[PDB]
Amino acid sequence: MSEKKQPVDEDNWDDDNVEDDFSNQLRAELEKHGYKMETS
Amino acid sequence: GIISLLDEDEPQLKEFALHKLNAVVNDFWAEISESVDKIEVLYEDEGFRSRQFAALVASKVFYHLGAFEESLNYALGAGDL
Amino acid sequence: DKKFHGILDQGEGVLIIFDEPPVDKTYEAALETIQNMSKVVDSLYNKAKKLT
Amino acid sequence: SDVNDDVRRAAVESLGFILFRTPEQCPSVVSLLSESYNPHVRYGAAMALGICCAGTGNKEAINLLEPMTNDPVNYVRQGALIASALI
Amino acid sequence: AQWSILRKDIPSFERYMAQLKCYYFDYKEQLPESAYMHQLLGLNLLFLLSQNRVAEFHTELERLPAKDIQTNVYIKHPVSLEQYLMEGSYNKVFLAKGNIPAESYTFFIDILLDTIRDEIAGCIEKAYEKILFTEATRILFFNTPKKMTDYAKKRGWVLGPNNYYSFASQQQKPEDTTIPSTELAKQVIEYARQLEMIV
Amino acid sequence: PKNPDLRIAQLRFLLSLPEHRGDAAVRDELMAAVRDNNMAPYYEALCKSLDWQIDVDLLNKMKKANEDELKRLDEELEDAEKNLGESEIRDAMMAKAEYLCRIGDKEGALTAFRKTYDKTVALGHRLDIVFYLLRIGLFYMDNDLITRNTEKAKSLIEEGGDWDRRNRLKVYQGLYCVAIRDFKQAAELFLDTVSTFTSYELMDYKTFVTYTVYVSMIALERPDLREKVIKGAEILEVLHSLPAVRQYLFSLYECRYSVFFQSLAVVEQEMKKDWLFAPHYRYYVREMRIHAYSQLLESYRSLTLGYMAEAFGVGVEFIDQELSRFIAAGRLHCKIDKVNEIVETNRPDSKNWQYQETIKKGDLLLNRVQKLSRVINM
Amino acid sequence: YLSKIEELQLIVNDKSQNLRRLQAQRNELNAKVRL
Amino acid sequence: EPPPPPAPQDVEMKEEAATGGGSTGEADGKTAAAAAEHSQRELDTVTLEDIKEHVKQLEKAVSGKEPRFVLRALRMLPSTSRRLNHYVLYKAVQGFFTSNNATRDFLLPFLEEPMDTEADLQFRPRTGKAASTPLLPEVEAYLQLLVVIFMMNSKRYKEAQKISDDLMQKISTQNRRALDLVAAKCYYYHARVYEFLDKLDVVRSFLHARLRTATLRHDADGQATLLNLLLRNYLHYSLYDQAEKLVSKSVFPEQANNNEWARYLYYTGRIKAIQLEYSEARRTMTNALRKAPQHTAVGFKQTVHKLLIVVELLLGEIPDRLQFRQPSLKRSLMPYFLLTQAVRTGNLAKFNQVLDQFGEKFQADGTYTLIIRLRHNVIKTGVRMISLSYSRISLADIAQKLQLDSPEDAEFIVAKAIRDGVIEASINHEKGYVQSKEMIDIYSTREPQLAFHQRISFCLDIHNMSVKAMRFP
Amino acid sequence: YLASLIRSVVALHNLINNKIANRDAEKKEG
Amino acid sequence: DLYSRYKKLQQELEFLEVQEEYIKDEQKNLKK
């Protein structure tokens, strides 16, 4: 055999793909896009 | 596939092909299961010589599948071979 | 904000208020089974422990 | 299946009558018949090991005769001891 | 094989092709190289694609996988064409027909035209509301044969002038009134047999 | 300790969000570096912030103050080894040695943690230790030690009963919860706002009132929402000080459309500047607006995003991809539409949606015991 | 083989006898309950 | 060294003491086809042998067990247990006596020594143990040069244990099944000897011929161990042999070790990956995924999950996979975190940047049929997300918002979406309206009360599995 | 509904003591 | 052996299926 080389050397696993979009993008999302109503 | 080749009206292709059957029978147990009807027709063809051998390797492949009783009836109607 | 089950219908008139409050069948059963899975977890250490 | 217990008692008396030639079958399952509700099927269950095997001295059948003469009911203990006199 | 398609003998064609698959399935790979060695797999890929055998398409992509990517644009082009049948269909068929310099593949992409025309005969009427005559003129080519007439009447529907309604479908709102209420408690009968076999 | 150098870890959070500048680094980096024999607040931000030109007359007079402090440690524990008291060495040296953890690095693990942990039986000194793994979980912003002080703490959660400090265990376990996405336990563990008036580990108690209202505004269903943040008597003063905070609850409870986003703009302007919340200002505030569209979209059924977009400001396409990512986000079931434009809500989970989780568990966990059930023979 | 393997796959039926010992175990069950 | 002598002296005699001394009680336990209580214990300690010290990992003096135990392989009158006790006292040939190495040189007449000595009195686990345990714990030397045929010769005397197994002792041995356990393991060593440089041409017709002697008459675990071999060689070896299964599909009567049944359902579900039967594959590969929880901490559960979830990505939709994050997985980037990120986005440039950028690792995938409908899974994820979001959507929105260049291309994607039953859309083909809509009657009128024969058919199946489980004691 | 919920709980009845008493009687037989 | 071996175990097999069939009626009567 089972080893042959290797003995010498509701959680996040659920969310990480949408939480990637909660990891790089849209930090102040409706707080600049929420500011589109009055800044524009 | 090499069993579908047998649309030639000369039976010596079928003896060449049974010479292939006992040769490469050690890998090709599946194709005769789709070629049961060819073993039925070539078995029920009287003057065609390879009806007894069709009962032999039909007993081999139905032995392989689990039709040991049709292997048995072919073993009856398989002759001295 | 408040409520009396006066659900909005623009084209009825009665603005139909209706409900079926006693459905405690699935309520009490689901509340039991949630605890039941915790009881089976409470059995899992006995099961996986007694064998090997 | 019957409610009348004397025909049940004769019914477990039949086993030594039909199975004396190969008698070594009965006590392994008439031992299970010894756990009946009544001293009728306990009684003929205490009889069947004896009248099945009495020509022999089967130590296992004797070993089943001892709790049958360790019964609460008295005459089934008696029948266990008479069948023990047979064995 | 070229004579079997010259005479249109398809079982002896794919049977001799199965022989050639047994000649590359020949247990000695150490064979001299025939000039048709890859586009015979292009022939097998194409008619095997046209006869709608997709597990044969995957053991086609699996019996010799690694050489199918780079060499033989007659292998890369029917599988990217299979990506075109997957997405972007009815847009690249005749454009792909504009690129076969090895003229043996038009014969089987006419069979691919047959599996085009039955899907026109199932995918523009009786799944929509109405299409006008000019869309059946575009996708149903030659603009009025008795072929697009044969398809419009092949649906079991009579055409209007300058229109093809896709009506007269999905009637009565079917319900199956009490039949599952019968037969599912007929299932509960042998569920009571499952109370019976257990004591 | 606690609060000055804790506030210097708040100045490490001032190193955190303005990264493009090195002046607000060096100003109170220097001002924090010159006071109270603080070798570490210029040592780790010597490693992280701007370096030092020299430190001879700058800060090696403060390693000289560390030398005087250290040589009176070498007075103190030798004066305490003659004495036989309450382990005078580890007490009179636990004071200046927790102060050594204030001076330099984590050597207050060995000369704080086990130094009074191996001695005492009362939870005061060990609770000062727990508070110090908290504050070093504010210096380094730990994952380990702010769990390991709960680990040492639960050894004395088993016995106790106290008003202020054990509710402060509830507080800082609350900050551990809402340091990551764990929300209701921080609010409920803060909810006894009375007993935490003033101890020398607090910041402004009014800012504690702000923090419990920021974590308590959601995980509090509308009867409990008005029952706590509105019907609370003693809370009304400590939110009456800051009017925009008082306005924020009153703007959300009013259920308008634009003051959701004016008010939400105010809470955005707060929710950058909060340590162990600045990694978490996305899901908190879409949690705000998913609470807003949840409480607002249920009652109407003849709803239209024209009538929404009139009072939001502009929401013709500005909430289009927003609510499309919200319905498409897995929650907020309504029906966004083409210009037919009718929004259609869903069930209250009385009948249909309830009929799922029984087989969601009876497949999964019952299938785990299907496998352990198949561990009988082989 | 003729009967020299029929007797062997016939010996395999003692596994079916073990199920009968489970059965006489079931009749031993509840006999003392009814008693 | 002084620490190298005592340890194999201890654990080695603890192995054959219970192995021979307990297997004596197993075959003398005249009906033992399921007990085998030191056979499977012994194989559990042989999986421990490959981790630990072997028969003699050339343990720094002479490697002397091999010139010790297979000499006088004779189970006579029970003073031959004192011959093995002489083989305990002679373990100081390394320590006391003249050290004489006989590994790889005299091991072939040592393989002749179970035949050179007297009659094996019907305890073949010792002799086939002596046909496996010499050289298969020497696979770990990894030179595989002229000792391929040596280890193979030890498997030829294992084939002599097949001759003495199913060609001798014609009255109900029931060690035949334990020798199918050991024989199957050294068939995996036929893989670990043949398949390093060749293919198992002997065990093609001897795969089917060992299957032939292990078909019905005394078959136990040879069925799906030889079918694990049948299933596992014939994936790297060319296919259609899984269609050679399809005319003669025979699976276990009762499931084996849950590792074996787990990995077996992983193998045949991994065939249904390339067979593109997406319905059964998600539940048998889910079953196979959850059913093997024991693995080495550097992986093989990330191998089983990695090569598991590819067609699950190709279902058209997928959940966000598993639920137990692994960082060595994160170092190896095996199941493509970034590519499934490109799946749940409707992105194409970074998507084909993952495709083109990582093709050396797409070699380690070896399943390039992923991309040919996985770009299609990007566009169907887009139309499924937008169509699932909006009540009505039109080609003016989606047909050029997703840059499909034309109305009719989106009408072809919705043609395949209604063809897949995904959307209840409609298209007015007159002005260019996708006059899409959403169907009604989501209530529990009919559909869950129809589903409760699947829920409760499931429940009665677990009732009867609990009853049959109760039938064992 | 009563068959679905309740008979699923009937499975939940049989399974627990059936497994526990099963492997008690199984691996505690020797 | 050989001939006597399935001349014992066949009769044991028939007897075992017979009273093995009887057990279900035993346990059925116990419930009544």
Side-chain angles (χ1 to χ4, degrees), chain B residues 19-58:
Chain B
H19 189 201
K20 290 166 66 175
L21 283 175
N22 53 3
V24 295
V25 71
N26 54 359
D27 196 75
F28 289 159
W29 290 272
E31 185 63 30
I32 311 298
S33 300
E34 293 92 10
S35 174
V36 174
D37 54 351
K38 294 176 70 67
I39 305 300
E40 293 294 329
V41 171
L42 293 178
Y43 180 74
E44 293 296 326
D45 198 1
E46 296 179 354
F48 176 73
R49 297 178 61 86
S50 305
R51 57 176 292 167
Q52 291 84 16
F53 192 81
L56 260 69
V57 292

Side-chain angles (χ1 to χ4, degrees), chain F residues 193-349:
Chain F
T193 63
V194 176
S195 65
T196 62
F197 289 117
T198 297
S199 177
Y200 64 96
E201 62 177 356
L202 284 180
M203 63 186 293
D204 190 7
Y205 178 75
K206 184 174 73 175
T207 58
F208 179 73
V209 170
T210 67
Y211 289 160
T212 186
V213 83
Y214 289 132
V215 75
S216 76
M217 49 180 61
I218 317 297
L220 198 66
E221 187 180 0
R222 182 174 178 84
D224 296 330
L225 187 145
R226 63 182 181 270
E227 193 271 331
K228 296 293 183 183
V229 312
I230 300 167
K231 270 77 174 177
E234 73 273 15
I235 198 66
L236 183 61
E237 295 85 1
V238 286
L239 55 86
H240 190 275
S241 178
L242 294 176
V245 179
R246 181 180 63 83
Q247 185 181 0
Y248 186 73
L249 299 171
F250 289 165
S251 299
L252 182 64
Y253 186 79
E254 190 180 3
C255 296
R256 299 292 180 181
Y257 294 87
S258 299
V259 79
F260 281 179
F261 292 158
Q262 296 299 109
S263 69
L264 184 146
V266 175
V267 159
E268 175 64 30
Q269 292 305 109
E270 179 67 30
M271 195 61 74
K272 297 295 294 296
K273 294 175 68 68
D274 203 359
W275 60 90
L276 55 84
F277 290 94
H280 296 282
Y281 63 98
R282 301 181 186 92
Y283 178 76
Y284 176 71
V285 202
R286 66 86 48 94
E287 180 67 31
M288 296 308 301
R289 67 187 59 96
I290 203 164
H291 181 75
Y293 292 115
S294 73
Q295 70 184 358
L296 194 147
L297 268 66
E298 182 65 30
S299 294
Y300 291 167
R301 194 176 69 190
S302 177
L303 196 153
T304 169
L305 66 92
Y307 180 75
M308 300 294 106
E310 288 173 352
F312 279 119
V314 284
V316 178
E317 73 272 15
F318 302 95
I319 70 172
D320 193 5
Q321 62 181 357
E322 176 182 359
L323 297 174
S324 179
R325 287 173 298 167
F326 285 174
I327 301 167
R331 299 292 180 90
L332 199 146
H333 188 190
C334 65
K335 296 297 181 182
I336 195 167
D337 198 1
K338 189 67 178 178
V339 299
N340 295 113
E341 195 180 0
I342 296 169
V343 175
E344 182 67 31
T345 179
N346 212 179
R347 295 294 297 162
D349 194 2

Side-chain angles (χ1 to χ4, degrees), chain I residues 4-23:
Chain I
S4 62
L5 279 72
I6 273 85
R7 295 299 190 271
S8 66
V9 177
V10 172
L12 193 146
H13 283 92
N14 296 114
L15 287 180
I16 303 302
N17 290 319
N18 198 342
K19 288 171 181 63
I20 292 170
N22 191 9
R23 289 176 292 180

Side-chain angles (χ1 to χ4, degrees), chain A residues 2-7 9 11-18 20-21, chain H residues 50-51 142 192 296 298 300 320-326 337 340-341 344:
Chain A
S2 65
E3 65 276 13
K4 298 298 294 296
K5 184 174 72 68
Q6 60 192 359
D9 293 331
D11 292 331
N12 241 306
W13 235 104
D14 286 320
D15 201 10
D16 206 0
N17 196 342
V18 182
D20 282 333
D21 202 8
Chain H
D50 290 330
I51 300 168
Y142 293 110
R192 290 182 180 93
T296 310
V298 298
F300 290 163
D320 222 16
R321 293 182 183 174
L322 299 40
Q323 70 284 272
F324 51 88
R325 294 176 294 164
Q326 180 65 251
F337 183 73
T340 185
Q341 178 54 243
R344 293 296 295 163

